[PDB]
Amino acid sequence: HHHHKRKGIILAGGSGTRLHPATLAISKQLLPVYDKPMIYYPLSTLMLAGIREILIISTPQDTPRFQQLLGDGSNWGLDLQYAVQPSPDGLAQAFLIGESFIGNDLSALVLGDNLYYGHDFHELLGSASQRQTGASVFAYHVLDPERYGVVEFDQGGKAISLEEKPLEPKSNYAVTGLYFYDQQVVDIARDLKPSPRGELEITDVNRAYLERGQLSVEIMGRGYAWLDTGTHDSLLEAGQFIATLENRQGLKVACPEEIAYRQKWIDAAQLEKLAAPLAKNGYGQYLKRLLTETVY
Amino acid sequence: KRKGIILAGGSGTRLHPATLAISKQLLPVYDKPMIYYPLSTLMLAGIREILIISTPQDTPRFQQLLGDGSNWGLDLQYAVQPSPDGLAQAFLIGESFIGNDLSALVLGDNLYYGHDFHELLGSASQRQTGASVFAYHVLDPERYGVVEFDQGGKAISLEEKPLEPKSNYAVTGLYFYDQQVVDIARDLKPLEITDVNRAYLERGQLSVEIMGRGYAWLDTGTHDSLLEAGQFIATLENRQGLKVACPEEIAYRQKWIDAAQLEKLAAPLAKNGYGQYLKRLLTETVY
Amino acid sequence: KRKGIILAGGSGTRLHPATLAISKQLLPVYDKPMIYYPLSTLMLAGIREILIISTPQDTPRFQQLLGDGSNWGLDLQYAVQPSPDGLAQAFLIGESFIGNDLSALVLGDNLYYGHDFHELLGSASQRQTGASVFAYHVLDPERYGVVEFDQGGKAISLEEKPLEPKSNYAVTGLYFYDQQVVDIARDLKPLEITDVNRAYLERGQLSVEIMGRGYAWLDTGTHDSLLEAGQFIATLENRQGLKVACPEEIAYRQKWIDAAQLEKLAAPLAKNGYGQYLKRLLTETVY
Amino acid sequence: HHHHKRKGIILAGGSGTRLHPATLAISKQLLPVYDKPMIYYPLSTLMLAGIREILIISTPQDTPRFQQLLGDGSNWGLDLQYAVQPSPDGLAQAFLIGESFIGNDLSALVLGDNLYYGHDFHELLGSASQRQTGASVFAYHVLDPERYGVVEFDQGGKAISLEEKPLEPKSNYAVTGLYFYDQQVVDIARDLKPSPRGELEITDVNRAYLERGQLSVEIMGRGYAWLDTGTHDSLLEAGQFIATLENRQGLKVACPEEIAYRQKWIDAAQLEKLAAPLAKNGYGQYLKRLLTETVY
Numbered sequence A, D: 001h002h003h004h005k006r007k008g009i010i011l012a013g014g015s016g017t018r019l020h021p022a023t024l025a026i027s028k029q030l031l032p033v034y035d036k037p038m039i040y041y042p043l044s045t046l047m048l049a050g051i052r053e054i055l056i057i058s059t060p061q062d063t064p065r066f067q068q069l070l071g072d073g074s075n076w077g078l079d080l081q082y083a084v085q086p087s088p089d090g091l092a093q094a095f096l097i098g099e100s101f102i103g104n105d106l107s108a109l110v111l112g113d114n115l116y117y118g119h120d121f122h123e124l125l126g127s128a129s130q131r132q133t134g135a136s137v138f139a140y141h142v143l144d145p146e147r148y149g150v151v152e153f154d155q156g157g158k159a160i161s162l163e164e165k166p167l168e169p170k171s172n173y174a175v176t177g178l179y180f181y182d183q184q185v186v187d188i189a190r191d192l193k194p195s196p197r198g199e200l201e202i203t204d205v206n207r208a209y210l211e212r213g214q215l216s217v218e219i220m221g222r223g224y225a226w227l228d229t230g231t232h233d234s235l236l237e238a239g240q241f242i243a244t245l246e247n248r249q250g251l252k253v254a255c256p257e258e259i260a261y262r263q264k265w266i267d268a269a270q271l272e273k274l275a276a277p278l279a280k281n282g283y284g285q286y287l288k289r290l291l292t293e294t295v296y
Numbered sequence B, C: 001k002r003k004g005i006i007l008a009g010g011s012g013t014r015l016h017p018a019t020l021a022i023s024k025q026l027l028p029v030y031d032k033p034m035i036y037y038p039l040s041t042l043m044l045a046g047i048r049e050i051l052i053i054s055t056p057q058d059t060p061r062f063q064q065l066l067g068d069g070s071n072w073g074l075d076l077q078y079a080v081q082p083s084p085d086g087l088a089q090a091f092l093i094g095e096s097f098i099g100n101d102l103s104a105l106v107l108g109d110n111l112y113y114g115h116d117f118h119e120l121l122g123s124a125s126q127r128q129t130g131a132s133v134f135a136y137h138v139l140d141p142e143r144y145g146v147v148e149f150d151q152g153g154k155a156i157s158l159e160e161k162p163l164e165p166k167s168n169y170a171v172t173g174l175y176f177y178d179q180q181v182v183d184i185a186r187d188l189k190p191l192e193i194t195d196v197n198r199a200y201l202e203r204g205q206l207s208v209e210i211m212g213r214g215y216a217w218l219d220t221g222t223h224d225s226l227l228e229a230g231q232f233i234a235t236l237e238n239r240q241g242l243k244v245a246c247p248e249e250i251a252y253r254q255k256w257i258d259a260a261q262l263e264k265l266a267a268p269l270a271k272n273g274y275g276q277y278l279k280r281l282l283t284e285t286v287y
């Protein structure tokens, strides 16, 4: 081989019956958060990390639905591919399903229902996606660490343990649903055994990187918003939250077309074409306004 | 007897991109799909035979969600509206479904809440001739059909989206009609529901009941208003430990389905709050 | 005749630091002070003579806000509760104010909304003997006085904050009493409102009306619930272009103040939406 | 004189009748935003800028009320003083009223009803308060620039004009209610004439710095939240917004006691005393928890 890059996975899996009957009609990661489908937020997050090649993993039923919404990604300067998860057998299963898509590249996994907002978010992802060996994750102070993977730090701020959904959390630092990996992850994933719960656990993957001294745990500070989209009540909170930012600023959070245009993955002419069929609503108007406004 | 029509029509691109993935009247308002609210309204009016009209794209969706209704003691049929050519078009599309019966039309994105709502609908469905509509005081009557009243409280004019509204009373998206409505609908020229209602008013056959300020009438037309409606329902539901517009519950309380059938519908939802709630309805007395 | 008591008692430190700067029942729920809601409730029950009971710190505040009531056609008096020693203490403090009349007690942080609320209070104020209270279905009956009903819907027990509630029916913070309540209150031992109500129940003189699910009963006890109540009122108000619990409007519609007096009250508020609204009430018919 | 600092002003003025009747009972900047009084947010902002000597300007009626809430500031390691504004004759009046308090020091003015949130907010204020000459302001993209002082930028991103409440804004960049000044501001303030509106305008002050080439205009990016507290509807939005962050994180935004403790203006023993009278509620519990939890 002669030499002369990082791929993305969004896991937009089966949310069971927990949100029924809202989710009988459609899958969770197609429900909107305010003005746009849920999937637009993690997708925008990957794009902001600089990732253009992305694998959307969803149920067999829902795959066609995501495909229709997003296509191959070519209109936004992306290359989207699709795969199915027959059964919700754990988040780490994404690496077995995604094996051939990853190939010998670096990867990044994002949960389909994870929403992030804040200043210099681009720069915080930059430093994770720039480290070419090991794994990088983010830890975020929360009220209810029991629901997540919890990181324990020593007095020097070094990460020393990881626990999935501990009943007695060692700290309030939760592992967020955004993960960066080197080429070792597929092989670490293949050697995992199901948990007592029947799942291939992402925390087991991260524990394996930690055990080799190859796990970077960056803090995502309190000045960032990491929102919960797990309940009816939290989905509603996230909507309110985005609407308040958007109506205050006259700017959008996680508008993929805008992110593609600012990254130079699409040009002015292409952005204008995408604005055309949306011209009679606020979203298309906003795309048009981006052609002529300078936004710092 | 009285049949129902839910018009769950084409919202265009106005709510894109939320609506690229799915039609509007399938978006949830808090914990359930939008369509559940007007459907519940019809059920509360005592109507079991109901026509769901939607776009060609969305009609199969609503079918796939709701089926023939038989699990909730209903009889649901489906029809398509090729182009959003006005709300009155429901009566042409719905012609053969209505047959020679009385009808009721409800808008697919109209949400109602309040005390004795069952009784308020009762009096409208009970009037066997003419048409019945409801007027509700709003901030922005320009968006709606506006009713003008004389000093005696008699309705004397109707205007669709007037630039200078004569009053702040808006016509809500719930309409009751006799057997004349199909023929009135056929004779309309370019297709407004306000024209239909104006024809009933011109013959002295339009009842305009006030829906008082103690009732909530919410519009799910915008991203902002959809979010308002969610907050509103969630606050009521979490306060009461009771649901608003749960079709299964309405069917059970109307005796259109029995305890055994309710239990079967609770089964596949058992692992979430909605199924638990259906189960709890078998054993709790709720006044 | 029936007198009113608003208990606007000491919230302790539980809402600090919001409440360091001012008492709770002066915090606004959306556009108006909290106290306006229970006050409006009493006015809607037809009660004009009202005792406001609060802490020593906060009583002068409520006085300075509301005065003697004469601008709204009311007669407001004030009294203090030195220590938050239970809601039933209102009747000892309020003894000489009540005199030999019938009474009504409302909690200072209780918010009610819905259709025909005037009529529901009417039937309670109209019963001249015994006591009347309202039961409302809630998610968390542990926080309240809980009513247990038999299979015939008769009330058979009352429990204050039981760990194992017998039903989900909570007693709301609105109470109507005959002339027996002062003497029942004096004979209580360490001072619960549920004990007072239990004494009426034990003599077969407690009416427990259901406040149905079509009514909203909101609690303003927490930061979270205060915020919920704000959202809820704002959504109704911005939808309707009408206010909930505007005392001036209630006084005007009850004929306790006239058009001229309403106009004077609109004057100093003219440059904001609230004064504009009072002005608009002089000329708009609202059903 | 022998040599061997920056003072703050919070303008918490008369909001007229615009929010009546909510504001009949009490002044605006004492209304809570969620769990805490409004004044706590701009105060926390000054503290985060490193400012300990602060002048609270309010109406004659409301002064005693702020005083009771906040005292002399000594419990939080601050030195708070108070002054009255007899009539709401414009924001720039703060420098005439504050003349003797400012003396020959550098200053910072913050509006009493301005709420800010985001990542590295400390660092963004640091670079403004660190510049010892000229003035520094912040520009923030909004939907409704008409309501504010608007900044116009040239193609190189240089600020070239300032307009107060223009009916036809030149950009969507609004000047936020946070201002840093050198020793020239009192004298610039003294030479101002009332506007057509009867007000001593802050924008006139800022225009004078601009005209001498001494106005730094830093962008406050979209990843920051700058919230509106001007209406009943916006006050409610700000509450929802703070509550969603706080309940998600189990951390507080603009808790002055926490900011004083992290700045080392008060010690562990002092923080424990302040937690005592609040022990039976969530706020005091949170102060206590800060003594033992490491928070990054």
Ligand SMILES: CN(c1c(N)n(Cc2cccc(F)c2)c(=O)[nH]c1=O)S(=O)(=O)c1ccccc1
Pocket: A041, A044, A045, A048, A116, A117, A118, A119, A120, A121, A122, A252, A253, A254, A255, A258, A259, A262, A263, D222, D223
């Ligand atoms: C507010 N954020 C954001 C931005 N910061 N930006 C500016 C941007 C765009 C492309 C590349 C950049 F480096 C910065 C956007 O164009 N859209 C955004 O939503 S964000 O970084 O917090 C964010 C990005 C993606 C998904 C969620 C939040």
Ligand SMILES: CN(c1c(N)n(Cc2cccc(F)c2)c(=O)[nH]c1=O)S(=O)(=O)c1ccccc1
Pocket: B037, B040, B041, B044, B112, B113, B114, B115, B116, B117, B118, B243, B244, B245, B246, B249, B250, B253, B254, C213, C214
């Ligand atoms: C809160 N409401 C309500 C009720 N009052 N009821 C009880 C009910 C059911 C059938 C007949 C009745 F009279 C009362 C419900 O079972 N579900 C409800 O959502 S409502 O009448 O205002 C309503 C009905 C239909 C759709 C939305 C709200």
Ligand SMILES: CN(c1c(N)n(Cc2cccc(F)c2)c(=O)[nH]c1=O)S(=O)(=O)c1ccccc1
Pocket: B213, B214, C037, C040, C041, C044, C112, C113, C114, C115, C116, C117, C118, C243, C244, C245, C246, C249, C250, C253, C254
């Ligand atoms: C929406 N409601 C309401 C009204 N229905 N009315 C109209 C009114 C006034 C006096 C007597 C009436 F029957 C009706 C009001 O004038 N103000 C109101 O807030 S309410 O009856 O549910 C209510 C009354 C008192 C306090 C809060 C809500």
Ligand SMILES: CN(c1c(N)n(Cc2cccc(F)c2)c(=O)[nH]c1=O)S(=O)(=O)c1ccccc1
Pocket: A222, A223, D041, D044, D045, D048, D116, D117, D118, D119, D120, D121, D122, D252, D253, D254, D255, D258, D259, D262, D263
């Ligand atoms: C979330 N923010 C914040 C923080 N970032 N911090 C951490 C902190 C405290 C003191 C000094 C620091 F450099 C950082 C806090 O202790 N409390 C806070 O509210 S903030 O910077 O966006 C903020 C600070 C003051 C007022 C409003 C927001």
Ligand SMILES: [Cl-]
Pocket: A220, A221, A222, A223, A224, D118, D119, D120
């Ligand atoms: Cl931060």
Ligand SMILES: [Cl-]
Pocket: B211, B212, B213, B214, B215, C114, C115, C116
């Ligand atoms: Cl009503």
Ligand SMILES: [Cl-]
Pocket: B114, B115, B116, C211, C212, C213, C214, C215
């Ligand atoms: Cl009811």
Ligand SMILES: [Cl-]
Pocket: A118, A119, A120, D220, D221, D222, D223, D224
């Ligand atoms: Cl930013």
